[PDB]
């Protein structure tokens, strides 16, 4: 099994002054990918009881979901690449981790404070393969605006992670350089064993050696959840399907490409084009 931990979100997407609502989040994108790829998948999330029916499609895609109690549901406004945290569900606490099973857990937060760093060592002791998304540690609400700030305790916590996911902007925030390969070297030097980095043209995986695969297709509306899809597909390929790191890198790129053809999470029919 793989478990994703993170908030679902009512996304308010604003394009040319037009507001459109999507029910998503990192965990939705990632969990649907792994489930459709044939790995037993669980989500631990928080939202209001009222909003649970907006996320019922998870169960329709084979995902076991634990909807934990919160007085609010996280909602993020995205202006097209600037984001605002409109509302925030309660953060995760240690007790939310109590029923963790499976070979793999991915920490997939939307905002710094959603998943307190103290949970990292607690979770480490419960799982064989622990991964996290940098978004949850560098994207910080300041008067709602989600600003990029360095992760002060990155050197302490990266050493707990088997895999760490970044995009260009997160990598630069953590390293001071916009050279993505160099950022990977620097981030691995902080202690993370494997770095997975997404950028416009494809995927870079670094474990001491670099592996790269380019995306084969893309769309404007399809880019949200690129990284979450890519991470989940890499985890499936490498952790569960026993692929070499090089093969799992190409696999993750292929799965991401077909998801990026449309808005929303990976669809069953996408896997017939890969
Ligand atoms: O990766 C994206 C990103 O964090 C967006 O700002 C958020 O609104 C989406 O829910 C998420 O899938
Ligand atoms: Mg991302």
Numbering used by the authors: 1 to 80, 87 to 280
Quote the passages of the study that discuss this structure, keeping the authors' original sentences.
Here, we identify a PPi-dependent kinase belonging to the ribokinase family, which is distinct from the families of the previously reported PPi-dependent kinases. Accordingly, the phosphate donor specificity of TM0415 was investigated using myo-inositol as the acceptor. This analysis demonstrated that TM0415 utilizes PPi but neither ATP nor ADP to generate myo-inositol monophosphate. Structural comparison and sequence alignment with ATP-dependent or ADP-dependent members of the ribokinase family reveal the importance of five residues: two large hydrophobic residues occluding a part of the ATP-binding pocket and three basic residues specifically involved in PPi recognition. In general, the overall structure of the ribokinase family enzymes is divided into two domains: the phosphate-acceptor-binding domain (the N-terminal half) and the donor-binding domain (the C-terminal half).
In order to elucidate the PPi-binding mode of TM0415, we determined its crystal structure complexed with a PPi analog (methylenediphosphonic acid: PCP), which has a carbon atom instead of an oxygen atom in the bridge position of PPi. In an asymmetric unit, two protein molecules were found: chains A and B. Chain A was complexed with PCP, a magnesium ion, and myo-inositol, while chain B possessed a sulfate ion, which is derived from a crystallization precipitant, instead of PCP without any magnesium ions. The structures of chains A and B were very similar to each other (RMS distance 0.6 Å for 274 Cα atoms out of 275 chain B Cα atoms) and also similar to the unliganded structure (RMS distances 0.9 Å for 274 Cα atoms and 1.0 Å for 275 Cα atoms, respectively, out of 283 Cα atoms of the unliganded structure). In chain A, the phosphoryl group of PCP near myo-inositol (the proximal phosphoryl group) interacts with the main-chain nitrogen atoms of G231 and D234, while the other (the distal phosphoryl group) is surrounded by K171, T204, and R232. The two phosphoryl groups and four water molecules octahedrally coordinate with the magnesium ion, which is essential for the kinase activity. R229 is also located near PCP, but its side chain was disordered in the structure. The disorder of R229 in the PCP-complex structure is thought to result from the inability of the methylene group in PCP to form hydrogen bonds with the guanidine head of R229. D11, N78, Q141, and R145 in TM0415 interact with four of the six hydroxyl groups in myo-inositol, whereas D12, G26, Q136, R140, and D219 in MI3K_TK interact with all six hydroxyl groups. In the TM0415 structure, the probable catalytic residue D234 and the proximal phosphoryl group of PCP are nearest to the 1-hydroxyl group of myo-inositol (3.7 and 3.4 Å, respectively).
